[PDB]
Amino acid sequence: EFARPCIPKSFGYSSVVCVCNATYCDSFDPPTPALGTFSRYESTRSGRRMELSMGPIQANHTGTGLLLTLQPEQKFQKVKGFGGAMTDAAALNILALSPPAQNLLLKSYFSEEGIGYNIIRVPMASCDFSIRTYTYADTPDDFQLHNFSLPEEDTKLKIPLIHRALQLAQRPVSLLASPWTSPTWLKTNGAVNGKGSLKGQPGDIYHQTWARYFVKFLDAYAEHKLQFWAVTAENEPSAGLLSGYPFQCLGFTPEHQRDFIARDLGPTLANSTHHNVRLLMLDDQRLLLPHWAKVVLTDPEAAKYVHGIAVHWYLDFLAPAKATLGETHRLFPNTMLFASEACVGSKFWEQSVRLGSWDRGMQYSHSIITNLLYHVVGWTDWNLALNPEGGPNWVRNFVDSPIIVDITKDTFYKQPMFYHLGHFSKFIPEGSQRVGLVASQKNDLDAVALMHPDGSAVVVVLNRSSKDVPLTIKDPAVGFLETISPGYSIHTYLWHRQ
Numbered sequence: 001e002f003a004r005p006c007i008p009k010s011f012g013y014s015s016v017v018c019v020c021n022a023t024y025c026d027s028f029d030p031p032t033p034a035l036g037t038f039s040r041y042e043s044t045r046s047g048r049r050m051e052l053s054m055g056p057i058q059a060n061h062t063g064t065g066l067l068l069t070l071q072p073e074q075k076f077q078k079v080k081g082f083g084g085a086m087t088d089a090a091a092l093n094i095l096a097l098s099p100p101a102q103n104l105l106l107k108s109y110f111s112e113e114g115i116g117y118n119i120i121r122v123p124m125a126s127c128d129f130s131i132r133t134y135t136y137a138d139t140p141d142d143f144q145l146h147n148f149s150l151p152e153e154d155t156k157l158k159i160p161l162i163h164r165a166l167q168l169a170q171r172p173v174s175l176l177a178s179p180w181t182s183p184t185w186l187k188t189n190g191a192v193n194g195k196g197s198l199k200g201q202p203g204d205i206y207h208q209t210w211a212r213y214f215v216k217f218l219d220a221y222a223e224h225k226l227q228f229w230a231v232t233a234e235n236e237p238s239a240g241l242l243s244g245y246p247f248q249c250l251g252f253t254p255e256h257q258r259d260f261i262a263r264d265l266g267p268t269l270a271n272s273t274h275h276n277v278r279l280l281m282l283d284d285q286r287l288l289l290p291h292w293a294k295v296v297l298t299d300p301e302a303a304k305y306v307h308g309i310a311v312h313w314y315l316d317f318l319a320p321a322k323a324t325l326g327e328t329h330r331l332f333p334n335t336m337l338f339a340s341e342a343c344v345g346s347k348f349w350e351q352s353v354r355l356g357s358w359d360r361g362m363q364y365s366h367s368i369i370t371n372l373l374y375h376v377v378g379w380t381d382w383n384l385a386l387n388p389e390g391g392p393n394w395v396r397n398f399v400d401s402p403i404i405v406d407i408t409k410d411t412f413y414k415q416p417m418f419y420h421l422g423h424f425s426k427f428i429p430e431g432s433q434r435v436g437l438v439a440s441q442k443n444d445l446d447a448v449a450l451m452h453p454d455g456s457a458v459v460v461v462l463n464r465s466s467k468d469v470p471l472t473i474k475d476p477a478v479g480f481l482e483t484i485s486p487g488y489s490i491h492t493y494l495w496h497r498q
């Protein structure tokens with residue numbers, strides 16, 4: 001409960017990382033405020049890291065500058081929350097630190113003294129961010145799944161770390177499970193990767209067996225006293241449609257997904273002790289919307305089992321939000337939209353890890369604001385931690401992560417992505433509702449307004465431009481916040497409307 005500042009370090013990129021070790025990590029002062037004043041948290045490319053300041057709320061405003069007006073009566077989605085993924089690679093990196101440094105990393109993410117993550121994505125067995133290739137049922141032709149078992153990657157690594165995150169967290173934490181591959185003996189191609197789907201057709205022994213695997217997985221985590229909020233129907237089902245797909249995948253067309261959900265996965269979950277665990281469909285690029293939503297959700301047998309739609313961010317440049325997220329929401333407003341995976345550095349021409357990249361931070365916060373403005377209820381980072389190479393990864397498919405672990409130094413680095421994510425996760429608890437926010441003029445800022453469950457306000461303002469922008473936020477209940485959005489900054493504004 002002590003403020004400790006960022007120990008900045010440059011690696012020659014646009015901004016700094018914050019250096020943490022066994023005895024030091026940047027942290028916040030204890031809560032907290034007074035009515036008629038606002039709190040501002042600010043992070044800048046120049047090096048400010050979620051720094052707290054306060055200001056007055058005035059009764060009047062005059063000027064022709066930018067005005068952002070809250071519309072608290074204009075109510076949209078409730079927020080599920082924010083988090084990242086406990087992959088094999090993340091677990092290995094976290095556990096490579098000395099235990100005191102491990103605790104500071106886990107606190108950064110999961111503690112109220114950090115950034116208040118309340119979501120953890122858990123791969124069901126191996127993915128690219130694994131050093132070995134395994135499923136939970138590798139013994140061939142085990143249709144009864146008698147040899148389904150959790151290996152050490154779960155029992156020694158992932159599960160104990162998840163328990164530690166839960167113990168650190170004040171907020172209830174939600175777990176999300178997603179599979180990459182089924183056992184190879186359930187697959188047309190008999191391999192964890194490449195083009196291939198489940199054998200046969202939905203409703204059959206292979207599909208009933210795969211659905212039961214999900215139940216066995218939830219059974220096995222429940223033995224270790226962990227319960228899931230949600231599962232996805234498959235990670236990136238389109239990937240297994242692609243010739244030579246280089247790592248674990250399982251192909252589904254949207255019709256295949258529809259019918260597997262309707263016949264096997266939905267009923268098998270609903271008839272299990274795990275009937276309250278929610279099912280998210282898609283878990284793939286938003287350009288697949290609204291088409292995938294139409295195929296799955298217009299079939300009433302599938303629709304009755306689908307709680308929400310999971311999206312990944314990787315091809316967002318191909319997929320304007322209004323045409324995809326917006327249209328899906330219009331058509332299916334009762335089916336929540338959830339961002340389930342994102343990372344920078346995964347394009348083949350990109351440097352995997354750019355320590356201290358401001359651009360990569362702005363990419364996260366711009367995606368988050370844009371998602372929230374188009375009805376999305378949560379946003380989930382990929383690997384919680386990686387090494388300086390962006391690994392480990394058995395196919396060398398290295399990417400970036402908000403926290404980079406340097407084993408030889410018993411050190412970890414919090415990147416601008418961490419702080420950009422924290423501008424949301426720390427200040428937007430589960431149950432917050434996105435409300436209206438209108439601009440008086442054309443502007444280059446990204447901004448979103450939400451209402452906390454206690455009625456207080458939160459506004460995030462991202463300035464991706466080089467230019468300082470003075471501005472005023474109007475709340476009809478309280479008054480005006482006179483402020484400024486510096487070039488290359490992100491601010492979170494908090495105030496009580498009491």
Ligand SMILES: *[C@@H]1O[C@H](CO)[C@@H](O[C@@H]2O[C@H](CO)[C@@H](O[C@@H]3O[C@H](CO)[C@@H](O)[C@H](O)[C@@H]3O)[C@H](O)[C@H]2NC(C)=O)[C@H](O[C@@H]2O[C@@H](C)[C@@H](O)[C@@H](O)[C@@H]2O)[C@H]1NC(C)=O
Nearest residue numbers: 004005006007008019020021022023024025026409410411
């Ligand atoms: C873990 O990370 C912390 C924070 O960076 C390290 O503590 C810091 O160590 C610095 C020295 O490396 C201290 O800096 C300086 O102060 C002196 C005299 O006042 C100046 O002349 C000098 O040029 C530096 O600016 C800094 O005060 C200290 N910060 C805190 C809050 O403790 C820590 O280093 C380890 O502990 C410190 C107290 C020293 O004993 C270090 O020699 C020692 O390495 C980091 N841990 C490790 C293992 O690197």
Ligand SMILES: CCCCCCCCCN1C[C@H](O)[C@@H](O)[C@H](O)[C@H]1CO
Nearest residue numbers: 127128129235236314341346397399
């Ligand atoms: C073939 C066309 C390329 C389209 C881009 C799709 C990129 C997906 C990125 N990918 C998602 C998977 O869920 C993770 O397992 C993987 O680590 C991550 C980054 O490669």
